[PDB]
Amino acid sequence: LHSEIGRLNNQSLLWGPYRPNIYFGTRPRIGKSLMTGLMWGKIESYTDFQHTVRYTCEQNEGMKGYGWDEYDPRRGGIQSIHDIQNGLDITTSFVKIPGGAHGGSWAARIKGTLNDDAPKDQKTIVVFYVSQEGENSELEAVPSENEFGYEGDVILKGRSEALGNYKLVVTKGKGVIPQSDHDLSRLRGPGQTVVQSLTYPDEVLWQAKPILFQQLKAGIDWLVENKYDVADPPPPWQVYLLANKPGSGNVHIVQKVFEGDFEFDILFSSESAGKEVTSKDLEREVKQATEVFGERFARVFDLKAPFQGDNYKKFGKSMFSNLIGGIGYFYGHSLVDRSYAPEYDEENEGFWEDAAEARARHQEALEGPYELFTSIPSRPFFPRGFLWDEGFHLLPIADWDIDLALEIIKSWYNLMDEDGWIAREQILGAEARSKVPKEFQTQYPHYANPPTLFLVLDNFVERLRKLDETLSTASVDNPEVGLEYLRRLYPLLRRQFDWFRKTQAGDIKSYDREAYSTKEAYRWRGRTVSHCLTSGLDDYPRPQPPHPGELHVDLMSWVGVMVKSLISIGSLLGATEDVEFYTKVLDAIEHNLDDLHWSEKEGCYCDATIDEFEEHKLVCHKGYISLFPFLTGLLKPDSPKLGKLLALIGDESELWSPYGLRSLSKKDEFYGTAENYWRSPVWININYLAIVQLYNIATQDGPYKETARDLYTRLRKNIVETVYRNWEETGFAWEQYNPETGKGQRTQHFTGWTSLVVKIMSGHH
């Protein structure tokens, strides 16, 4: 029955607009298969279209905003795009229609409305680009009746082992098609939909922009060769209209030119499903998806006071939809240094210079291929899987669709190598690499990242203890199913736990270090003079200089998170030998957190280092790091150390701003210095952890119940209102928020863990 649920999930989730790196395109969760993408741009001159054309996501002055208004990966959704440069408000509606044996069918409506500013007679070029990778698969444009192109719909017939037979139709559409009175029209037609059918080696099919332009360039060269010149030039939009040449190939370019508003449909009909998809089906299925989205939202994200109003609902729907709508399918090779150079052990003083020298050996090589199905932080800036981010992303996604979350967890765990390592940044394939400078592609098998995916696992476990509708919760509703999923995943969790302890070990025994346990001590590998990227808090201040004797309290706390989850999951699976080992490790971390990391003088946890005199030293920098045992849920509700942490948390002159908790205290010598990334701004992911832990203490007997209740109330409100106020004014989720001004700063479109705000509003943790 677990096998059955699995197959049903695969069939449910196979198709999606799973190319979040581009404004709009679709691909199935198959590495080498059929992909589509949308391009559009105004044309006002003979040279502007290369500059106006839109394809890959960006964010600059020329784009007001864009995002999913509604989205569920099993059903589809609606995206809106506000393009200032091209004076167009665009909507792309995508819908899935289950049926047959190849993952069902789907349809999209693309609608473009000129805004008030655009010339009413604007010409907009629109391209639907279709490619298919695979050795024995085929795709063919059925030729038109007419001489120069298409008066009606464009029909592509294709086949592959993965998809069986299928047809993909690009409908005629509605809107004015400009007509040219030029002599050229006798050879190219007056103006009509055209198709070019081409083949390139499969591995370059993703390069849609270059492939299109090469065809446009061939067209213009033809004009030059055939005496079309500046004495009497055809209009721009006709100069840039491809000569129709439909056929067989692994690339199909479908081009339309419109004057004024336009719309057209794409209908993907899986042959194994019977009757083909129509535009009427599309309109009906779109109406249905919205009603279903609306109903699940009200149930799953029931916003509590004071955020129950419609403004907050719309805010919540926007934040949530952008998060789950960023889900992508990525496929390809990664760049990995598999030298395990000894310099990477970082055992000596000055280790960063040694590590730099090893990296300058450039032993890294491509490996894989790998696939990943994941949500992402940022469509415009880094549309790809990041390990600790995904733990935050799946917290709301799991609420919505636990089976989906587990699907993504499984996807990530399927990347884990033999040692227990998952690269913290997944850059899969040439297309993904294109967005990343080569110096930054290389992953290192000694680099960890927080195991936040365990948090998602923990929520699943408590839920396990206490058709698309049904599928979304199958793995909790059917406890046999849920448990089997854990059984299969459990060894990889255990492997990762072990990997952390082998590779991210700190050094107690080698120094004058007294502690309850001789084993429990941790140090993030990969630190440079100013950074610790692997911890996730890039430039939070750390002992200077970095040192093999460093110990990092955040990392120890993450191991505490892991072992607690392992206790839970081990228990469920009856792994008694494992549970008793975990039990002893937890007990040990509890004591060693105090013995190595507690500062009585400072009233908080500190990282530790080793003196010029070879003695243990605490290095306190009051901020997120300082609160880690509390953020990760390792402290008892009665703990006096907790009470001291609550005092720091609530203290306005340290961490507490009107807009959330500051990453670093205003009193810290490093406040607002250098790049000031994690040295003052308010970050939603860590504020979320604080909020959840305050609420835990607030809903339980203890000395700090009321304090925590008050801090919960205020921090929830502060965080929510800051993110809302910024969304209201700018339309964006931001990466972080200014604690002086409350302004969003760093990157826009960060959905992204900022979207946690929807779960904060929902409450009842």
Q: List interacting residues with ligand UIO (CB under 6 A).
A: 377, 381-382, 386, 388-389, 435, 536, 538, 747
**Residue closest to 457 by CA, chosen among 408, 501, 389, 385:** 408
**Residue closest to 452 by CA, chosen among 371, 394, 375:** 394
First to last CA, the chain: 31
Residue number with CB closer to ligand UIO (236 or 377): 377
Alpha-carbon gap, residue 551 to 618, rounded angstroms = 9
Q: Give yes or no for a contact between 86 and 41, defined as CB atoms under 8 angstroms apart.
A: yes
- Least CB distance from residue 675 to ligand UIO, whole Å? 11
Residue number with CB closer to ligand UIO (539 or 550): 539
Alpha-carbon gap, residue 45 to 594, rounded angstroms = 70
Residue number with CB closer to ligand UIO (115 or 434): 434
Residue number with CB closer to ligand UIO (370 or 381): 381
Structure-token pair, residue 194: 């055209």
Alpha-carbon gap, residue 333 to 366, rounded angstroms = 6
Alpha-carbon gap, residue 722 to 737, rounded angstroms = 8
Alpha-carbon gap, residue 38 to 92, rounded angstroms = 10
CB atoms within 10 A of CB 440: 9
Q: Which of 538, 594, 602, 651 is catalytic?
A: 538
Residue number with CB closer to ligand UIO (526 or 536): 536
- Least CB distance from residue 383 to ligand UIO, whole Å? 9
Q: Side chain identity at 529, as an amino acid letter?
A: V
Detail the DSSP E strand segments found in 508-593.
none
Q: Give yes or no for a contact between 83 and 41, defined as CB atoms under 8 angstroms apart.
A: no
Residue number with CB closer to ligand UIO (624 or 712): 624
Q: Give yes or no for a contact between 557 and 520, defined as CB atoms under 8 angstroms apart.
A: no
Residue 740 φ then ψ, to 5°: -85, -45
Alpha-carbon gap, residue 137 to 241, rounded angstroms = 29
Alpha-carbon gap, residue 539 to 605, rounded angstroms = 18
Chain centroid offset of residue 665 CA:
30
Q: Side chain identity at 159, as an amino acid letter?
A: R
Residue number with CB closer to ligand UIO (386 or 454): 386
- Least CB distance from residue 435 to ligand UIO, whole Å? 6
Q: Which of 72, 281, 354, 735 is catalytic?
A: 735
Can you spell out the DSSP letters for 32-84?
Answer: SSEEEEEEEEE--SSSSHHHH-B-B---STTEEEEEEEEEETTTEEEEEEEET
Catalytic (active site) residue 399: no
Structure-token pair, residue 50: 């290369």
- Least CB distance from residue 747 to ligand UIO, whole Å? 5
- Least CB distance from residue 321 to ligand UIO, whole Å? 19
- Least CB distance from residue 411 to ligand UIO, whole Å? 18
Residue number with CB closer to ligand UIO (425 or 668): 425
- Least CB distance from residue 622 to ligand UIO, whole Å? 19
Q: Give yes or no for a contact between 79 and 38, defined as CB atoms under 8 angstroms apart.
A: no
- Least CB distance from residue 626 to ligand UIO, whole Å? 18
- Least CB distance from residue 742 to ligand UIO, whole Å? 20
Residue number with CB closer to ligand UIO (472 or 663): 663
Q: Give yes or no for a contact between 29 and 116, defined as CB atoms under 8 angstroms apart.
A: no
CB atoms within 10 A of CB 186: 9
- Least CB distance from residue 381 to ligand UIO, whole Å? 4
Catalytic (active site) residue 538: yes
Residue number with CB closer to ligand UIO (270 or 374): 374
**Residue closest to 719 by CA, chosen among 683, 665, 666, 677:** 683
CB atoms within 10 A of CB 334: 25
Q: Give yes or no for a contact between 144 and 127, defined as CB atoms under 8 angstroms apart.
A: no
Residues with catalytic roles: 538, 735
